[PDB]
Amino acid sequence: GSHSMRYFFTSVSRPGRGEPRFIAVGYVDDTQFVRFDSDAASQRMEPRAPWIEQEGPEYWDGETRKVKAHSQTHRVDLGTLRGYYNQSEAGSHTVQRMYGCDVGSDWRFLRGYHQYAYDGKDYIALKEDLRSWTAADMAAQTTKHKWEAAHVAEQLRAYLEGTCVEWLRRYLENGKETLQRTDAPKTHMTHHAVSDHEATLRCWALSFYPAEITLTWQRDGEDQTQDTELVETRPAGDGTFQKWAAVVVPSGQEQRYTCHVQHEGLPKPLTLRWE
């Protein structure tokens, strides 16, 4: 299917407490493969999946050099933004950057993205044409004019259509066993009596990969996107994901409810009835 490579950068000023925090993490699809943490001992880009360890020492030197340039430019950015927004140096502030690319089934380039937040709100984003910027306010307009002059959009477009796609494909090959796998959900239902006249059916999906999944309750074959609770898909800690959907039913009527599980590792979708 489709695939994506994504980098995530968090930059937090630490007033009085020294240099700011900087954390970088990279993902292919729903799997993390690298990290950098300014607060760690190594001061190096670090492997976080075994198939990225195959790359030689020169590669890790080079990723370490680039992440260090990211970190130093984010450090400068915190001061700049403090000034753009006339803020004192007493408060902690957060910068976030996300970028990466999407490929299709053929592994050809689909789209690219580069986005920047300040204190939890959009600051500036590269639009899907990979030529133009979305600037929130007056501050981001100053950044937009600086980034137009420096041709940042063109640098990013070169990266997104080339390096990003080039190394996305290389990680997909190198980590074939893990990245190109699908783990189908292991399913089951539970039953909780709430009152004497009501019961709770909960539909479980466990140990699946990737995280994309659909769970839906139906009463007499009619979907219940009205009276069913649903929890955010969550990591198990072992590379797989978990999720459940629960509907409260009139006790005695359980057989009229069916849960439906849709996941890419399932040839046909599953359908579960209570017991």
Binding site: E55, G56, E58, Y59, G62, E63, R65, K66, A69, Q72, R75, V76, G79, A149, E154, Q155, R157, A158, Y159, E161, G162, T163, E166, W167, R170
Partner: protein, 124 residues
């Protein structure tokens, strides 16, 4: 767009002063002069590339975009990842090419050091 054209004109002369201001005209400075003629050619060529990529495109020009993509990609591999570039030499020029690529990678690492040292000393 008139603005884009104006900005390219303005950048052109901005760089001309950066060339001119340090262009000492001596004898035994003949090689510096020849180097700066080539720099002016590059300034003009890069302005033309900008005109083609932006400014509608005045059609009758080769869009530099795909060259930007491949050149960024090869440069990330030469300088950083060390992934091998294919079909870039034969036996007769393998050594010259490897030598200049190494010199080049060192120059880019030195450039990063030089620039970020500036931010360390005065920018923080």
């Amino acid at each position: 767009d008139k603005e884009i054209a104006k900005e390219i004109f303005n950048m052109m002369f901005m760089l001309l002063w950066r060339v001119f201001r340090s262009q000492r005209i001596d004898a035994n400075n003949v090689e510096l002069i020849k180097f700066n003629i080539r720099v002016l050619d590059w300034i003009m060529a890069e302005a033309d590339n900008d005109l083609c990529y932006f400014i509608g495109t005045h059609d009758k020009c080769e869009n530099p975009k795909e060259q930007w993509v491949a050149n960024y990609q090869n440069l990330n591999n030469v300088v950083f990842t060390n992934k091998e570039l294919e079909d870039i030499y034969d036996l007769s020029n393998k050594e010259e090419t490897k030598e200049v690529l190494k010199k080049f990678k060192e120059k880019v690492n030195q450039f990063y050091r030089h620039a970020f040292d500036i931010i360390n000393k005065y920018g923080l």
